[PDB]
Amino acid sequence: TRGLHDVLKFLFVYIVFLLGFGVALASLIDAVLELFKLTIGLGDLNIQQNSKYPILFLFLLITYVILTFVLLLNMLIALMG
Amino acid sequence: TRGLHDVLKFLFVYIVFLLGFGVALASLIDAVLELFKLTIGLGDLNIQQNSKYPILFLFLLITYVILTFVLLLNMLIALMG
Numbered sequence: 001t002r003g004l005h006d007v008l009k010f011l012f013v014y015i016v017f018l019l020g021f022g023v024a025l026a027s028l029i030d031a032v033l034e035l036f037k038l039t040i041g042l043g044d045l046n047i048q049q050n051s052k053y054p055i056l057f058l059f060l061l062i063t064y065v066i067l068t069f070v071l072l073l074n075m076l077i078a079l080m081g
Numbered sequence: 082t083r084g085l086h087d088v089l090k091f092l093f094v095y096i097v098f099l100l101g102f103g104v105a106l107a108s109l110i111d112a113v114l115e116l117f118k119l120t121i122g123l124g125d126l127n128i129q130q131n132s133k134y135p136i137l138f139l140f141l142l143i144t145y146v147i148l149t150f151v152l153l154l155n156m157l158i159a160l161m162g
Contacts, residue, residue, distance in 0.1 A: 043123055
């Protein structure tokens with residue numbers, strides 16, 4: 001460097017939101033935050049990581065889409081703003 | 082937040098359209114709305130989820146492309162507008 005402040009606020013937002021969104025459903029149903037590969041990486045494959053017994057996490061998947069929606073808008077607003 | 086209205090209209094449009102498009106063919110041929118991964122996720126793999134006996138759903142796949150076409154235009158018009 002001797003030879004990011006705007007992003008610094010941004011990276012905190014995803015990190016804060018990922019902790020919140022993850023605690024909402026990812027922990028509800030080591031860490032499992034590997035699902036934050038918004039660019040690409042792994043897909044969805046429903047929600048089956050550990051203790052995949054039928055629970056109310058199905059409705060949380062809709063909220064997961066809601067979380068995905070704002071994440072797309074979050075980067076769009078800042079990167080293109 | 083103490084430390085989206087335009088998107089709110091948008092997310093309703095996809096949700097309304099997904100219910101309509103899904104009821105059109107996805108339910109015609111638990112839920113199967115996981116096919117709405119427009120960004121990436123799972124591909125198509127034809128149409129074989131449950132009761133894959135030969136039916137008129139083949140023509141609905143063309144309508145599925147038609148549905149895909151407007152979904153691409155739906156986000157393009159709003160996000161870039």
